[PDB]
């Protein structure tokens, strides 16, 4: 289930983090605007960029902790506030996070693994609720 998926992803996180985030940037090209340094590069070129690997993994490092700390796929208000108040998230809307979890759930459904895809969809919807409650537009 959801808690087991956190262990599955964590066991190969750098791989999952890159593949999921690449699926996100490819499904939603306009999101590369928030990552100007990724425009005009293929997946393999991004996977060889140091900042891409490190940052994408750090994103998923924290995302798994937010998911780990959640109760019934509802994240703690503190994690939501942390995400909203980060300097690097100033200028991001709920739609940004909304699209990341669309790509995440679609990636899980297409992986053919036993991910609890419905729980991650809920987790993303609830995280968006918490992000809006914490002050994100």
Residue numbers in the entry: 1 to 137
Sentences from the study reporting this entry:
Our model protein for comparing methods of RT structure determination is the coelomic hemoglobin from the marine annelid Amphitrite ornata. Named dehaloperoxidase, this O2-transport protein is capable of oxidizing a wide array of substrates by either electron or O-atom transfer. DHP exhibits four activities common to heme proteins, peroxidase, peroxy­gen­ase, oxidase and oxygenase, with each activity employing an Fe(IV)-oxo (ferryl) intermediate. In this study, structures of a multifunctional globin, dehaloperoxidase B (DHP-B), obtained using several methods of room-temperature crystallographic structure determination are described and compared.
In this structure, the heme iron is pentacoordinate in both protomers, with no evidence of a distal water or dioxygen ligand. There is no electron density to indicate a hemichrome species in protomer A in this case. Notably, in both protomers the distal His55 residue is swung away from the heme iron and towards the protein surface [Fig. 2(c)]. A water molecule has been modelled in the distal pocket of protomer B. Due to its position, this density could also arise from the alternate swung-in conformer of His55, particularly since a water molecule at this position would not be stabilized by hydrogen bonding to any protein residue or heme propionate. In our SLX data, difference density indicates a weak area of positive electron density suggesting a dual conformation of His55 (data not shown). Modelling of a dual conformation for this residue did not prove stable in refinement and so only the primary conformation was included in the final model. The observation of conformational change of His55 in the ‘swung-out’ position, in contrast to its ‘swung-in’ conformation in the damage-free structures (SFX and NX), implies another site-specific radiation-damage effect. A major advantage of the Laue method is that far fewer (181) crystals were required for the Laue approach than for the other microcrystal-based approaches, with the drawback of more challenging data processing. SLX is particularly valuable where limited numbers of microcrystals are available, requiring far fewer crystals than are needed for either SSX or SFX.
